Write a protein that binds this ligand. Structure first.
Ligand SMILES: [Mg+2]
Ligand SMILES: [Mg+2]
Ligand SMILES: [Mg+2]
Ligand SMILES: [Mg+2]
Ligand SMILES: [Mg+2]
Ligand SMILES: [Mg+2]
Ligand SMILES: [Mg+2]
Ligand SMILES: [Mg+2]
Ligand SMILES: [Mg+2]
Ligand SMILES: [Mg+2]
Ligand SMILES: [Mg+2]
Ligand SMILES: [Mg+2]
Ligand SMILES: [Mg+2]
Ligand SMILES: [Mg+2]
Ligand SMILES: [Mg+2]
Ligand SMILES: [Mg+2]
Ligand SMILES: [Mg+2]
Ligand SMILES: [Mg+2]
Ligand SMILES: [Mg+2]
Ligand SMILES: [Mg+2]
Ligand SMILES: [Mg+2]
Ligand SMILES: [Mg+2]
Ligand SMILES: [Mg+2]
Ligand SMILES: [Mg+2]
Ligand SMILES: [Mg+2]
Ligand SMILES: [Mg+2]
Ligand SMILES: [Mg+2]
Ligand SMILES: [Mg+2]
Ligand SMILES: [Mg+2]
Ligand SMILES: [Mg+2]
Ligand SMILES: [Mg+2]
Ligand SMILES: [Mg+2]
Ligand SMILES: [Mg+2]
Ligand SMILES: [Mg+2]
Ligand SMILES: [Mg+2]
Ligand SMILES: [Mg+2]
Ligand SMILES: [Mg+2]
Ligand SMILES: [Mg+2]
Ligand SMILES: [Mg+2]
Ligand SMILES: [Mg+2]
Ligand SMILES: [Mg+2]
Ligand SMILES: [Mg+2]
Ligand SMILES: [Mg+2]
Lengths: 87, 85, 122, 79
RNA sequence: UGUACCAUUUUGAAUAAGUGACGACUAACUAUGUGCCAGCAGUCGCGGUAAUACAUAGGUCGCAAGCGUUAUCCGGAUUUAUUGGGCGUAAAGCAAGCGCAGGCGGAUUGAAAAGUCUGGUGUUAAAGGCAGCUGCUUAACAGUUGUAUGCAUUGGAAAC
RNA sequence: UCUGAGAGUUUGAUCCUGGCUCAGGAUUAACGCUGGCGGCAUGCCUAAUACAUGCAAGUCGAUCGAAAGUAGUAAUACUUUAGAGGCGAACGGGUGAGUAACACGUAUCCAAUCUACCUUAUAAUGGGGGAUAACUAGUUGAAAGACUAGCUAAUACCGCAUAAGAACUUUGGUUCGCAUGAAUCAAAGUUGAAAGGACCUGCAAGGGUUCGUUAUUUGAUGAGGGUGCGCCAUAUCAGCUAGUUGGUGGGGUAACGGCCUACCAAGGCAAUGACGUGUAGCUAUGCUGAGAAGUAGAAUAGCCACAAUGGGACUGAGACACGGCCCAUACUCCUACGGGAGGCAGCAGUAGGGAAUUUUUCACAAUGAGCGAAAGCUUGAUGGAGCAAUGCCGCG
RNA sequence: CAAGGAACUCUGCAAAUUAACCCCGUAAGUUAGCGAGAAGGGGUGCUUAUGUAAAAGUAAGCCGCAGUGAAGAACGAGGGG
């Protein structure tokens, strides 16, 4: 029940996220298993320096993304590679 | 096949006065945290002489751990070099 | 019928395990104390975490008797141990709870607080 | 100081306990009857009750397996 | 949240300075009062009628929206000294001996490889640590990449 | 490529041994004086003391009967939810009382284990039956409720037919292992499944997507056990241990195991510190030091333990369950005197202790969780805003 | 002899409790011999079976308010002269 999801590690009035593979029952901002890549709500462009390597391994393993997590994958195009690799 | 390998320990028998037992003693040379000198220790593990191994007192015996057969017994005897006493 | 120098139990939370009667209060040569009677007592067996200390002279009212007494209808109420609870001048219990059952003779002689703090009246 | 979910859960588990206890008692009486007057016939009934309970979860699957293996050992020894 | 911020928007220096110390360690001194009295003090110590050490005042110095005092931890302290101390006269050689276990230990050869050294792999969670960079008016701060330490296993070295 | 500052003080004066004090940092800090603002962060160290009051885990009508409301002549259409059922309530949040040992850190072996939902792959999802919530009526009550008799529904429950594969054995082969021992067959015997919902098409018959279900398969996550090493003070604590040590057969546990049982024995640990006493959550880390290391385990993060005190168990993939259940103890409160109610070490706040540490706040808007197809819904986690020169930084 | 239990009296005088056997456990002090039957507790009947030379004991069952069912069997602790 690994779940690629976010983790807030910014400061007051300035969030900062990191895509990460973690279990569902682990608290947010806690212990995790593997690092994918970071995010910034105000990076203008390239807001999601993705990895494109282990992420495909964990999704193939069966990781369940989230709504905002999925969103990031689509603008780069990671959803395409995952679904076509399934096929 | 590929089978994870168990840990081994080489020791000497100190006493044997029960049914199927052998109180072996294993030594080690752990360093000292501050004065940095080797110190000889002594700890007495127990094992079972199920058979074919006997290993009476004074017999230099090698020891491999095993699933706990009982409380305080988690080791088994094996090959015996320098059979004496 | 509790009499002079009678050891009896306390049915409340106050730290007093054994209490000894000193005087059967009420008149001259009052021989016995029946249910509802007030007596002067001395704490003899107490506990460290108790409001009373060993040796204090205090006033108590009896609630149970081994001998028992007979009511007007003919019913004879009889307990298995003599018990008393420590009371204050106002007739208000010193403890915050009462253990075990109590008689109905208390109701006649006031003692409404004792009845309301009991487990069940008999 | 109380939650309807917790209250409802307590009310449901009383009924579940009744039903599961009935099922467990049948297995207990059946294995005792079997080993009483030993007979290869009974053995079958033992399998049916143990496997069914194991699927429903009422009994841990491992306990059914150990009971099954051990009861079959008695028959082979006696036959 | 009509919040940060912005503008040639009105008024206008207007709405804003305290605390410790001044004999030495320790940058900074005079007068008045008191007269072993009243008081100060982290240490040495000041006060007995000419007090730069007390009280007040003026001056001056150290700090600053903070300044002093108190409490606790570390350093300085080589003042429990493995690194890194001593035992004649300053603290410290038992009154002396026989001595098991422990520690140490002559020379040469062979083997093994437990110490010892080295290569490969795994791991030592993330934050923090140090270096670089970015973003907040720069900073504090946040993010970013880099950055060891030990353990286990395996392959070699053979001087002690 | 690391990298270290001293001074005062015994004497009439000097040298040395030697103790005391100071110059530097630092804190969950407090007190006195004073006091303008902004950006970050911190904020009961004590009484794991007791708590007023209000909030802190629910969700699905696309599982099911019924009821209610609004429109409609009617058939019916829409909305709402007390109850049955599924799922989640074991996550998340708080505190550090207990605990000196496999608790924890590290490395490991689980030929001695579990894992619901999730991943891959593979067979089925046919047909019956008996019940009870809601409702009605009666008794008992102010009400909470409780008891009694009838009425219904299903993805609730219980049989039956059926096994691609499963589980337990039997027959001999295979490949063997680290001692118990695993690994693979071919044949056979024995045993064992469930449930439908939404929508589309089709005159119909039938067909179809999707959710969901049973039986398996792959992994992964999470949980559990054992072991080596490391991990406080004290000898002005020297013996301790009788399920303690071992074997046998049996029972139990997810599993090995004196975990339990009956028998047979007398061992095990201990001066290389047992046992006892006192103390303490451990670790990554914080402060300090040139370094070796000393010191505290703020905040936060990993692991353990706890939920007024002490025990037991149900349900479940997972609890012996903070705001579930049962019992006892202590404490408080309500009553119409028969009976009951309660657990702020969840967010605030109150009383008390203290030298001393804050809103009885707003919103799920972002992140996160639980249920749902969505609409959504619930989130004192979380995100903000108050408060305080509490610390760093900046400007007047 | 119901309730109380030394309130009686110069004084627990007298009376009352315990009492046999078997199985647990037993302190301060000491001249190391004792204290000590210390203190404090438990079981006892009948039947069946197993145990033995006989037992004692062990397991199951039965009855009564009570089972050395009656007789005979030590009350104890602490301080002082
Ligand atoms: Mg053995
Ligand atoms: Mg179960
Ligand atoms: Mg002064
Ligand atoms: Mg002056
Ligand atoms: Mg020092
Ligand atoms: Mg030092
Ligand atoms: Mg010296
Ligand atoms: Mg000398
Ligand atoms: Mg000499
Ligand atoms: Mg001498
Ligand atoms: Mg000599
Ligand atoms: Mg020697
Ligand atoms: Mg790290
Ligand atoms: Mg940072
Ligand atoms: Mg001098
Ligand atoms: Mg200083
Ligand atoms: Mg509803
Ligand atoms: Mg709960
Ligand atoms: Mg919890
Ligand atoms: Mg929190
Ligand atoms: Mg706390
Ligand atoms: Mg589930
Ligand atoms: Mg049906
Ligand atoms: Mg069938
Ligand atoms: Mg079903
Ligand atoms: Mg055994
Ligand atoms: Mg503690
Ligand atoms: Mg130093
Ligand atoms: Mg902390
Ligand atoms: Mg804390
Ligand atoms: Mg609560
Ligand atoms: Mg609170
Ligand atoms: Mg509490
Ligand atoms: Mg939300
Ligand atoms: Mg500040
Ligand atoms: Mg500043
Ligand atoms: Mg009498
Ligand atoms: Mg009497
Ligand atoms: Mg008298
Ligand atoms: Mg008299
Ligand atoms: Mg006499
Ligand atoms: Mg005596
Ligand atoms: Mg005398």
């Amino acid at each position: 029940m690994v779940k690629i999801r976010l983790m807030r590690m910014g400061r007051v009035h300035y969030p900062t996220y990191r895509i990460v593979a973690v279990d569902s029952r682990v608290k947010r901002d806690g212990k995790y298993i593997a690092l994918i890549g970071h995010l910034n709500p105000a990076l203008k462009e390239n807001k999601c320096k993705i990895d494109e390597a282990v992420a495909l391994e964990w999704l193939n393993k069966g990781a369940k993304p989230t709504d905002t997590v999925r969103s990031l994958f689509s603008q780069t195009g990671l959803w395409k590679k995952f679904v076509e690799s399934k096929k | 096949m590929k089978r994870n390998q168990r840990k081994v320990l080489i020791g000497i028998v100190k006493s044997t006065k029960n049914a199927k037992t052998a109180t072996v003693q294993v030594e080690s040379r752990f360093k000292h945290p501050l004065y940095h000198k080797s110190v000889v220790r002594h700890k007495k593990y127990q094992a079972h002489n199920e058979g074919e191994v006997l290993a009476k007192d004074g017999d230099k015996v090698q020891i491999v751990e095993t699933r706990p057969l009982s409380a305080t017994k988690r080791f088994r005897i094996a090959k015996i070099i320098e059979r004496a006493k | 019928m509790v009499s002079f120098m009678t050891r009896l139990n306390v049915a409340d939370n106050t730290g007093a395990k054994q209490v000894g009667i000193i005087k059967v209060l009420g008149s001259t040569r009052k021989r016995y104390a029946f249910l509802g009677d007030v007596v002067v007592v001395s704490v003899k067996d107490a506990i460290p975490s108790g409001m009373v200390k060993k040796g204090q002279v205090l006033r108590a009212v009896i609630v149970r008797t081994k001998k028992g007494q007979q009511r007007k209808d003919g019913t004879h109420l009889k307990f298995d141990d003599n018990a008393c609870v420590l009371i204050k001048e106002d007739k208000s219990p010193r403890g915050t709870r009462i253990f075990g059952p109590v008689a109905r003779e208390l109701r006649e002689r006031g003692y409404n607080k004792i009845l309301s703090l009991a487990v069940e009246v008999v | 100081a109380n939650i309807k979910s917790n209250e409802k859960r307590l009310r449901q588990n009383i009924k579940r306990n009744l039903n599961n206890k009935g099922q467990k008692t049948k297995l207990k009486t059946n294995v005792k009857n079997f080993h009483k007057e030993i007979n290869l016939d009974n053995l079958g009934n033992v399998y049916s009750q143990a496997d069914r309970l194991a699927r429903k979860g009422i009994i841990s699957t491992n306990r059914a397996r150990r009971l099954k293996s051990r009861n079959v050992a008695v028959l082979n020894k006696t036959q």
